[PDB]
Amino acid sequence: MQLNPESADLRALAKHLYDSYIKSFPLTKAKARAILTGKTTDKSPFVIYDMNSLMMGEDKILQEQSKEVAIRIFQGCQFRSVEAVQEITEYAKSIPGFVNLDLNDQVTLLKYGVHEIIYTMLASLMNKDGVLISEGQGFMTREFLKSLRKPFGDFMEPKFEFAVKFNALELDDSDLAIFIAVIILSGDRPGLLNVKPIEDIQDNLLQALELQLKLNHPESSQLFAKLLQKMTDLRQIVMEHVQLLQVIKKTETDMSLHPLLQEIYKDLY
Amino acid sequence: MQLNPESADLRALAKHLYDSYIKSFPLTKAKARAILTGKTTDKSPFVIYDMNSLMMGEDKIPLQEQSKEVAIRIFQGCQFRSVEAVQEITEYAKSIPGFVNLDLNDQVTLLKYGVHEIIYTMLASLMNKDGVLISEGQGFMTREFLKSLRKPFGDFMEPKFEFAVKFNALELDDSDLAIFIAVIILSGDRPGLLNVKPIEDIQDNLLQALELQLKLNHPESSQLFAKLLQKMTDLRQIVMEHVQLLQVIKKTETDMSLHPLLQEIYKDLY
């Protein structure tokens, strides 16, 4: 490793991705950690730890029902998911060379990868106790999400399980900006014609990420390998999610989905 | 990259894994590629490209519907080998430095989730754009023939062929495969394990060994380490779509049994 024009360019590529990551995503890992440790005073979130804390929290964010509780939560998860797909698309277009690829392959790269990004970025909002909700305005506890009516008391546990392992790597927004870009640009997704120009964009991004982690994480040896193996855990989560979603469409027929999400989930896994 | 005691040890770890890989697996990539390119002069396999080539081929290896009878036998022969393969992988796993000293419940666990990932990584060595070597180089079944089989069997081999194409383009050899296989086995993030600390401790070395092997052996391929690691993603997807498909053949066909060794592996998996 040395200071040469190629290394200087890999840093330039890294800065670019970071600046566009900041421009695309409003709730950054730095921003969310600050809240999660109480370093901010403006963003003091309400904690939803039970039913009585949820009903009071709905005032900020029939006679009696617990079914309406699991329905309302799940709908709000897909409410944010749609807003998130918009940001990821805005971001994807800023990756050097993405636009100049086949548009039918741009559609493809975003179709399979959007969910992997969603969950990578969701871990930034999480801790062993719970998740930040409503752009940092609320905090829903892990155990509360777990107590929800079957089979909803299981749709968030794999994300929390992942989040714990991922967060132990101690990555920052500068590292996440390259990693997110790496995930998008993959030459092993189905329905791709031009894998050659994609694998060349990713080769640069991987070269950029390897250097970023070398400079930023002197302590973590084999982090590059560790971070790359998390893409395996992300695919499993995306797969177990669509597998769980088929149970919602079947067992509880009266549970609709947004047409933007309906197109993504169609003919996926 | 430098020559120091740690690097010398990583090479020793690499040699060890290769020598046990050779001892465990009889049909190596080198061996299979020679058959596939007609460089061997004895192992001349019979090509099964349709129905008539299969019947004549069955002479070399039920009044029911022909298309159903043929799909059933093929699918059974895929699992007959799969069993023989699990035995080889287990023999290999025991040779990885530190595997035996771990928890035996964790040893059972690691092999439970990883055996299928290895099976498919090693299956790609027997494959080319045209088909797959069957019965240890005695036969060659075509991709398109496997694709024509009665629903939903005409779909169980396509993901393996798709993978194989991408994996083989990396141009790995038995030395590289020997470390990669070992890396897959020592996966930390699997269910039913509490001793993640010693498991990760083994994989960190294996990964360090693989990074050096690819650096020395593949001077041309600059991000081969990153590329090869991303294939573990494709392997998990295949193992997942496989168990998901296996569910269909039991619900569709009541008269479709499985070997008790495989029955234990697939149980409570994905």
Residue numbers in the entry:
A (entry chain B): 230 to 290, 298 to 505
B (entry chain A): 230 to 290, 297 to 505
Relevant lines from the article:
PPARγ (peroxisome proliferator-activated receptor gamma) is a transcription factor of the nuclear receptor family that functions predominantly as a heterodimer with RXRα.
In both functional states, PPARγ T475M crystallized as a homodimer. PPARγ T475M, localized at the dimer interface, exhibits an increase by 2-fold of the binding affinity to RXRα compared to PPARγ WT, as a consequence of a slower dissociation rate of the dimer. Interestingly, the most frequent mutation, T475M, induced a slightly higher increase in the ligand-independent transcriptional function of PPARγ as compare to any of the recurrent mutations considered. These regions are thus more protected from deuterium exchange for PPARγ T475M compared to PPARγ WT, which might be in favor of a decreased conformational flexibility of PPARγ T475M compared to PPARγ WT, in agreement with MD simulation data. Thus, our structural analysis of PPARγ T475M indicates that the mutation stabilizes PPARγ helix 12 in the active conformation as well as the heterodimer with RXRα, leading to a stronger binding to coactivators.
